[PDB]
Amino acid sequence: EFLAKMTNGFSGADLTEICQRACKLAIRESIESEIRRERERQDPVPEIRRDHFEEAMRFARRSVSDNDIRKYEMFAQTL
Amino acid sequence: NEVGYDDIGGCRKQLAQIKEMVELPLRHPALFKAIGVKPPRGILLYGPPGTGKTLIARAVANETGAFFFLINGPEIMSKLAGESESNLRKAFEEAEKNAPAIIFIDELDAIAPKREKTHGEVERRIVSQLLTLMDGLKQRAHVIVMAATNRPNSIDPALRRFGRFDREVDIGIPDATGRLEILQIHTKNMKLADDVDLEQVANETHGHVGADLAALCSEAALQAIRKKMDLIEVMNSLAVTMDDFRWALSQSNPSALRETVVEVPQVTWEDIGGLEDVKRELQELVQYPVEHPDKFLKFGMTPSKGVLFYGPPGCGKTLLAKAIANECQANFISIKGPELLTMWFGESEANVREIFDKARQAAPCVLFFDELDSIAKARGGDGGGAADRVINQILTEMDGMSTKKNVFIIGATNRPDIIDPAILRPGRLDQLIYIPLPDEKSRVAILKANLRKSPVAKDVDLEFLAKMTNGFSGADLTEICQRACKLAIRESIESEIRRERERQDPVPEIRRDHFEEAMRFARRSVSDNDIRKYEMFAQTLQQS
Amino acid sequence: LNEVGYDDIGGCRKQLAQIKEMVELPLRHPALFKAIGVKPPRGILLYGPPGTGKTLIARAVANETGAFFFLINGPEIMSKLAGESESNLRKAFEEAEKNAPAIIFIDELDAIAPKREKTHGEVERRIVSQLLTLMDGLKQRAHVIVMAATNRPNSIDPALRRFGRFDREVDIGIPDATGRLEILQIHTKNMKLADDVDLEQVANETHGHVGADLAALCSEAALQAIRKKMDLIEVMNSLAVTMDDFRWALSQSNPSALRETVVEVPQVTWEDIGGLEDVKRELQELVQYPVEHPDKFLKFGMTPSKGVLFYGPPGCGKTLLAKAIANECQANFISIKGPELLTMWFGESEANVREIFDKARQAAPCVLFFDELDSIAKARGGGGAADRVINQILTEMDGMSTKKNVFIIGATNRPDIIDPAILRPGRLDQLIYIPLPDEKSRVAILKANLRKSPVAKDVDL
Ligand SMILES: Nc1ncnc2c1ncn2[C@@H]1O[C@H](COP(=O)(O)OP(=O)(O)O)[C@@H](O)[C@H]1O
Ligand SMILES: Nc1ncnc2c1ncn2[C@@H]1O[C@H](COP(=O)(O)OP(=O)(O)O)[C@@H](O)[C@H]1O
Ligand SMILES: Nc1ncnc2c1ncn2[C@@H]1O[C@H](COP(=O)(O)OP(=O)(O)O)[C@@H](O)[C@H]1O
Ligand SMILES: Nc1ncnc2c1ncn2[C@@H]1O[C@H](COP(=O)(O)OP(=O)(O)O)[C@@H](O)[C@H]1O
Ligand code: BEF
Ligand code: BEF
Ligand code: BEF
Ligand code: BEF
Ligand SMILES: [Mg+2]
Ligand SMILES: [Mg+2]
Ligand SMILES: [Mg+2]
């Protein structure tokens, strides 16, 4: 709910991209932990984390701009 | 050298289907008689070229106890009028009379051109005769007809409907396990070595189709033989090792991509200075999807696939592309901007379709759509009304009614503002990577990498050069180094010619005077206004 | 005595070794292959630019290999009757396999294998399907090797190009200096030429030739030598081709590839240009060092620069320098005016640009001269044909290519219009400025322009 409230101009594609980026960050952390564990030898992160979501929010972006979306409103107004 | 079901691998479901179909009715029709419904009596094998269709056909023919009849597609018709139909009738009647036999037609797309586009009356008559013979009155009893074709689309729907060719077994490309099994099958008959990693070879091999695995094995054997060229007690010790396996693997490319293979210069990640973030992101993006699919499946969402590079000209977009091509574990396809456009109507869309189909077939592949500016304008006095159609084709192919197994799209451009907003939408080109002009550390690294293999005197001050040059770019630094090298070579040539003339290694390393002279007239490549435009475009998106 | 042999092939060692390793060993002694276990390749395809020697290699292999040989001209299997082409092809293959472990050679198979998909007819489709099924299928091969030869292999079916039918596609590329020297030595084995000729030098000057043009040069030199004795035409035993004859033949001859782009050029030497000594020297170094001393560049481990741009007020010596280079430069020259490569058809302009650049790099080392660069490469901002062509030029000039050697010389007098992308270092790095003459430059140009003319001594320059 907080993420949705903060994001205003985003769209479903942007939200899906944020989720995918969070997943990629989680996988990167997991694989780094596993490789370090193996190296020291010779599921640390079972769930996506608030820090991962924070990074995704940090470097997410908006798909379309208000100036661009105005065109659809104008077309609807025309009819 | 008999070939049987033990000589085929990488196709379990399809092989099981064909096996049960060809055995159950033959081994005992009592069960099917008790059930009441007769089993199917027709199958069509379709797939990309060189997947194993003919191998399956010949294995079934040589292993089944029932009589087998073979009919090459372009073999029935003869000079005499009304002879192809007679030949077909004679073949079918002889086969059915002989025994509960099996008919195999190879490349029937040459004899069934859809019955609509064909012009010659012979083709229409033969296809109609085949249809009538397959489906008529009291036609067949205890006979199964096979098929094998590369283009199932160009077949008659009347022939493809149930009762003539009802089931279409898909013999597709294998996976890692399939490639491992195929390699085991091919290498079993030969004494390879005491130290081989077939699992590693299968992992490395990505877009091959079994026939290419056989080609790789043959190339490895040839390299092993040539390793004894000087020697040629040898045949006994002949073997193939990891060395020639790796050599053949490096030289091997999938048969599908033989059409669009172009040599590219060799470059390695150490050749690029700075851009640590971009390098790490590209490496992770191209590695994780094809390295740890289990984690992606467990988390439950497919990862990003597209990436776009936008920045001032002379930052290293093409250099990163070359590095990816040289040091990627996935097949690389290079396509220029307007290479897919032709004057004919719709042939540009046909080329786009076939290139994306090739990429999907050879997946995992990385597509480098260089000059997206040229490829796709924003939208639309149209110039032939084809740019819009091509752009729509690209959009729908990239994100439409498809699974999108594994195909990464990379775009390099320097005018992002003339790109259609749809392309930038997440899910197509979600990753917008910005490559700024190098800073002090980046310039130092770029110069050091550029001068990696060259005789350079110690008096040089790379830090001093980096501090002196502020707005320069990688291209500018490369040009400065090239100027220095040319001045050194000119000095060497003049000294050598003077010394030879006087008679009838003066300079072993480029020197500080050479660098000073070269830098005397260095010029910037990208203007303040252009860099400001790029930064503004970056800001309008970051602020979003 | 005139039969071509393996020694008759020159300028191709790696390709010849690749051909032999799979043509001779299986027929020489297959014991090693049997011991290894895996069968060797049984199909090869020769592809390269026209007139490289692929047909000569095929002829030598046919005339040297002991095993039975069979040949099939491509556009010759077809017959007027219906289905007769497949009958002929099947009979040829059957008799070839029955006779012995023979060799089948198909010449220009691209005329009988039209990709099976883009073709709209039916006879060609049936023929290609027959060929596919005949080479690959049940009862595949009785130890029979197939060969092919096409100048352009792209227009061939991918199924044909797949392993098992045509697996090894040896590329017979353009020769080098040593290859040209070997070709000249091979061709000049039946001439009482002289005791003073140095074929190495002639090979050095000969740059873009592809062997067939070397043969043409030798024939032209022989014709010149025989014509030189027209007055006397004791003569039969005195015939001989001299270094002067070779010089004349070399001066007259031009590479076959650049034949389509041959244009007359006025003869102007360096002395005809007044002043601009620094520009002349810099350009000479730029165009000479990469081709003259590549060893030093390799030692220094850096590729040389390949771009220069001429910009200045009209009437200063830009096109004059271009003419001087086209006349007195060792490398091949290609002159293209600005809008020559533009056509109304959709994409044909890009096709023309790609064709020209491919031809230039293929015939390298050559210097490509662009005139009205501001006209060809407009800034960025009728269907965007200008944008598409500029993008094509940029990408094919600095894309995923080896960029062997093509020097681009730019001439224009409106530099501001040209977009910054072209002027980036690495494409047209050198920005040479040609200003209006000073007093000394004016005196020098006057002297050069009055070099050959009757002028009274009273004239003061
Ligand atoms: N599943 C497989 N297992 C083992 N070898 C295979 C397999 N698929 C293909 N091959 C090898 O590659 C070749 C390609 O299959 P092939 O029967 O020629 O198919 P096609 O009829 O499409 O040309 C086979 O002849 C065989 O040598
Ligand atoms: N980071 C870098 N490190 C080393 N050389 C670089 C770097 N960036 C650019 N260069 C040099 O500048 C050239 C131009 O960069 P490139 O990737 O070709 O960009 P573009 O495709 O926009 O022309 C490169 O080919 C390379 O020679
Ligand atoms: N590598 C070569 N060595 C010697 N002579 C050559 C070579 N390449 C070409 N030639 C000469 O030039 C001719 C043209 O080459 P050729 O084999 O006919 O090629 P193509 O059939 O593609 O035109 C040859 O017949 C031969 O006389
Ligand atoms: N420095 C010069 N030396 C000799 N002739 C010159 C010189 N500058 C100009 N000319 C003469 O004037 C003409 C115009 O110069 P040119 O290089 O052709 O410029 P442009 O191509 O812009 O018209 C030359 O073709 C030549 O006839
Ligand atoms: F290449 Be096969 F005939 F599918
Ligand atoms: F010069 Be690059 F292609 F931006
Ligand atoms: F001109 Be050749 F036949 F390649
Ligand atoms: F007058 Be020139 F062609 F600049
Ligand atoms: Mg087949
Ligand atoms: Mg580029
Ligand atoms: Mg020929």
Side-chain angles (χ1 to χ4, degrees), chain B residues 96-266:
Chain B
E96 190 277 331
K97 180 215 81 67
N98 188 359
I102 301 160
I103 306 299
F104 171 44
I105 298 90
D106 198 355
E107 294 276 0
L108 62 86
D109 57 346
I111 58 175
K114 193 164 275 299
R115 194 149 56 79
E116 209 75 358
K117 312 304 190 268
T118 182
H119 288 50
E121 271 292 320
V122 176
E123 295 87 337
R124 253 195 301 280
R125 272 196 261 88
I126 183 164
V127 63
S128 161
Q129 213 284 336
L130 191 143
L131 261 60
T132 300
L133 199 149
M134 200 92 70
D135 281 347
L137 62 85
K138 307 183 185 182
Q139 287 298 127
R140 313 191 320 220
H142 312 177
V143 67
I144 298 102
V145 301
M146 281 181 231
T149 180
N150 297 115
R151 306 175 304 118
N153 286 312
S154 82
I155 310 290
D156 195 315
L159 188 44
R160 200 199 275 219
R161 65 98 182 175
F162 163 73
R164 309 205 180 83
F165 292 123
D166 51 357
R167 321 150 80 82
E168 270 182 19
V169 303
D170 184 71
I171 305 165
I173 311 311
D175 59 61
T177 62
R179 281 175 299 242
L180 193 171
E181 191 167 74
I182 285 184
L183 271 162
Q184 293 273 18
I185 283 160
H186 268 299
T187 60
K188 186 174 179 183
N189 191 271
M190 87 187 186
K191 163 195 177 180
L192 73 174
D194 59 356
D195 172 24
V196 181
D197 196 327
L198 289 181
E199 181 196 350
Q200 180 173 359
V201 173
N203 269 320
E204 291 256 30
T205 316
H206 267 286
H208 297 42
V209 286
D212 193 2
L213 276 297
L216 176 78
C217 175
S218 177
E219 294 293 328
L222 277 178
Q223 170 49 217
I225 297 169
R226 284 178 287 177
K227 261 194 162 64
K228 314 283 277 185
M229 183 177 177
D230 52 353
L231 298 163
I232 67 191
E233 64 91 15
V234 299
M235 71 305 288
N236 56 358
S237 73
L238 272 192
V240 286
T241 62
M242 201 36 48
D243 313 328
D244 63 358
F245 291 165
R246 224 182 289 288
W247 195 66
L249 176 50
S250 77
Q251 304 186 256
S252 168
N253 271 313
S255 302
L257 275 289
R258 221 186 264 283
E259 193 174 30
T260 179
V261 65
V262 62
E263 52 159 352
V264 301
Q266 183 274 350

Side-chain angles (χ1 to χ4, degrees), chain C residues 8-12 50-56 59 183 186-187 210-212 215:
Chain C
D8 188 271
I9 322 305
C12 283
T52 310
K54 52 182 83 65
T55 301
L56 179 63
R59 189 185 330 149
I183 295 150
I186 292 294
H187 272 90
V210 306

